[PDB]
Amino acid sequence: FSSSRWEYGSPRLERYNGLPSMEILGQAAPGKSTGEAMELMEQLASKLPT
């Protein structure tokens, strides 16, 4: 009565609040300043598909 195939599926499923998460840690290591980093990210963090 059955029949199994491989697939890819995810071992950890995030959530930041209501919504489905996805945590990206990092850091802005010697040079710039912890809000050049943020800034920077926010920046490119409005490129990402709709």
Interface residues toward another protein, by CB under 8 A: 17-19
**Alpha-carbon distance 14 to 20, whole Å?**
6
Which CB sits closer to another protein, 14 or 36? 14
**Alpha-carbon distance 23 to 33, whole Å?**
21
* Residue 18 Cβ vs another protein, minimum distance, rounded to whole Å: 4
* Residue 16 Cβ vs another protein, minimum distance, rounded to whole Å: 10
Length of the chain equals: 50
* Residue 26 Cβ vs another protein, minimum distance, rounded to whole Å: 25
